[PDB]
Design an enzyme around this catalytic site. Structure first.
Site, mmCIF file in Angstrom:
data_model
loop_
_atom_site.group_PDB
_atom_site.id
_atom_site.type_symbol
_atom_site.label_atom_id
_atom_site.label_comp_id
_atom_site.label_asym_id
_atom_site.label_seq_id
_atom_site.Cartn_x
_atom_site.Cartn_y
_atom_site.Cartn_z
ATOM 1 C CG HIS A 165 42.267 34.963 40.249
ATOM 2 N ND1 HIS A 165 41.369 35.698 41.002
ATOM 3 C CD2 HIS A 165 43.228 34.521 41.098
ATOM 4 C CE1 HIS A 165 41.728 35.640 42.274
ATOM 5 N NE2 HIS A 165 42.855 34.907 42.357
ATOM 6 C CD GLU B 252 38.083 36.669 39.183
ATOM 7 O OE1 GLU B 252 37.766 37.037 37.998
ATOM 8 O OE2 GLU B 252 39.115 35.969 39.454
ATOM 9 N N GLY C 184 47.466 34.787 49.071
ATOM 10 C CA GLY C 184 47.210 33.551 49.832
ATOM 11 C C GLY C 184 45.803 33.494 50.413
ATOM 12 C CB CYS D 77 42.503 34.431 46.160
ATOM 13 S SG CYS D 77 42.951 36.179 45.913
HETATM 14 C C1 LIG Z 1 43.925 42.105 40.921
HETATM 15 C C2 LIG Z 1 45.131 41.409 41.503
HETATM 16 S S1 LIG Z 1 44.832 40.795 43.153
HETATM 17 O O1 LIG Z 1 46.094 40.374 43.692
HETATM 18 O O2 LIG Z 1 44.049 41.762 43.871
HETATM 19 N N1 LIG Z 1 43.900 39.439 43.015
HETATM 20 C C3 LIG Z 1 44.360 38.277 42.243
HETATM 21 C C4 LIG Z 1 43.822 38.343 40.836
HETATM 22 C C5 LIG Z 1 44.665 38.135 39.746
HETATM 23 C C6 LIG Z 1 44.204 38.221 38.441
HETATM 24 C C7 LIG Z 1 42.865 38.502 38.251
HETATM 25 C C8 LIG Z 1 42.017 38.675 39.316
HETATM 26 C C9 LIG Z 1 42.475 38.618 40.614
HETATM 27 O O3 LIG Z 1 40.724 38.827 38.869
HETATM 28 C C10 LIG Z 1 40.825 38.938 37.445
HETATM 29 O O4 LIG Z 1 42.184 38.697 37.069
#
Ligand SMILES: CCS(=O)(=O)NCc1ccc2c(c1)OCO2
Length: 182
Positions: free
Chosen positions: A41, A72, A146, A148
């Site tokens: 992402h 992912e 923040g 990720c």
């Molecule tokens: C699910 C939202 S979150 O805030 O937990 N993580 C960011 C995120 C945003 C888009 C995504 C993803 C992860 O994986 C596929 O598309």
């Protein structure tokens, strides 16, 4: 504070860079040579910023399992003048559960951040931001925007990268040795 944090710090100090894409700043784990990982992402393009230096992307591959399900993880090869310490021998060979994990983040917003997340479950399937996702690890910590790309370690193993949360739980994509054979 203890040997969990010791191993986490050793990985952060040598094997992380700050990656910036059009989708934000991410902790980015360098694995060997000029090969690193980031959450898919992050939407890596032809150019990425690495510690605020404009860097050509030589290759980027969004990993999927053999059922063609999102993992992912994006593997990036960077046009960088320096190699990472080779840490592939700290990657697990198989899917597993873990005790006593640490999530470590290094960005402009969260420098030198270490979170003891505790027990890690082989969760498997997750609908992550609407996308069916496999090989998810889960920990019972209220992780936030923040974090990720944050690195999930135990003593002696680098087991995942943080990819999301639901406010109460956090979720990491597994790293497996088989992703980085050459
Ligand atoms: C699910 C939202 S979150 O805030 O937990 N993580 C960011 C995120 C945003 C888009 C995504 C993803 C992860 O994986 C596929 O598309």
């Amino acid at each position: 504070m203890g040997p969990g944090f010791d191993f986490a710090q050793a990985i952060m100090k040598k094997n992380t860079v700050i990656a910036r894409t059009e989708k934000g700043e991410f902790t980015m784990l360098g694995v060997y040579d000029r090969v690193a990982v980031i959450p898919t992402h992050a939407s890596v393009g032809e150019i990425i910023y690495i510690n605020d230096v404009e860097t050509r992307v030589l290759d980027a591959c969004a990993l999927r399992d053999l059922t063609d399900t999102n993992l992912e993880i994006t593997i990036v090869k960077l046009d960088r003048n320096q190699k990472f310490r080779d840490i592939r021998h700290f990657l697990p060979r198989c899917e597993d559960d873990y005790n006593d994990a640490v999530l470590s983040v290094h960005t402009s917003k969260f420098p030198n951040m270490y979170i003891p997340v505790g027990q890690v479950t082989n969760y498997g399937f997750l609908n992550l931001g609407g996308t069916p996702t496999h090989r998810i690890l889960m920990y019972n910590f209220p992780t936030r925007a923040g974090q990720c790309g944050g690195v999930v370690t135990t003593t002696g193993k680098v087991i995942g990268i943080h990819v999301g949360g639901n406010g109460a739980q956090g979720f990491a994509a597994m790293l497996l040795h088989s992703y980085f054979t050459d």
